Symmetry: C3
Subunit: 115 residues, 3 copies
């Protein structure tokens, strides 16, 4: 049950009003996890630099209980990198994505955990 | 020595001016860790969706050097979920909480680490 | 290939317009990692408390594929704590820094991962 967030210096105004449903629909397919169990967080107007340049960049993170591995993460990257340059106009080379495989017992939800 | 943050789309104005002291007092008891060593971070006005809905939701995280386990996390969840709906009006089902057990050697503080 | 972010309640206006290049130049030396592969994220105006006080504080995080260990983290802390009080006027005792050693296979970049 994944969460994907984008932290970028790009301004709020360049944020396609589609992104949210967009990243939800895509990650759902990609990870093969329920669209209802996916939460997306977009953070623009941020103060950040990459390689010492304040040009458009992003540091993202995908947390998922499973669906995280070697070939998977590459697949996700190409996917998320394609979406990020197209929608936010963020070059692929100025983007990091931290992938995380959470343990069910460490994910609280609706009052309890997934354990 | 825990840190608990709330990232929500709810607007800054619905943030009880008590929450900070509130979550501090509670987590302190819950985890049985010094109130002085707890830091709370609240992030409202955020761009996020859950299950493809932009309705009130939250993705939280509790980082603590210990005090993290099976039954503990459930206990924390019910606690944090009760507080979050009551104070921020966020339904329990549209809330994720990532629990993390940090290693003392990996937590810098006041110039050094807890190792 | 590190990322260092600062989340503080200090106001945007107290953020030296140097910090970005500053933390980049320093971490680069410190961790001995390419300045081009370092991304810095600064988050001010935030709602946070520490020890139940809303006075200037910060919760930072340094993610790096390696260059993370026992004596390293202490060294980094003293470094980052010196920089944070001098530049942002944040006392060393009201600052936490979470250090993370990422696995290359879990870091997407420019379309693929570092694996």
């Amino acid at each position: 049950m994944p969460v994907f967030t984008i932290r970028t210096n790009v301004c709020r105004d360049s944020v396609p009003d589609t992104l949210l449903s967009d990243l939800t629909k895509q990650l759902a397919k990609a990870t093969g996890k329920p669209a209802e169990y996916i939460a997306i967080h977009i953070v623009p107007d941020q103060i950040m630099s990459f390689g010492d340049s304040t040009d458009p960049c992003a540091v993202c993170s995908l947390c998922s209980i499973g669906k995280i591995g070697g070939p998977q993460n590459k697949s996700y990257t190409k996917l998320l990198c394609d979406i990020l340059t197209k929608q936010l106009n963020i070059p692929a080379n100025r983007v990091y994505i931290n992938y995380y495989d959470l343990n069910a017992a460490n994910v609280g939800w609706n009052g309890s955990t997934f354990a």
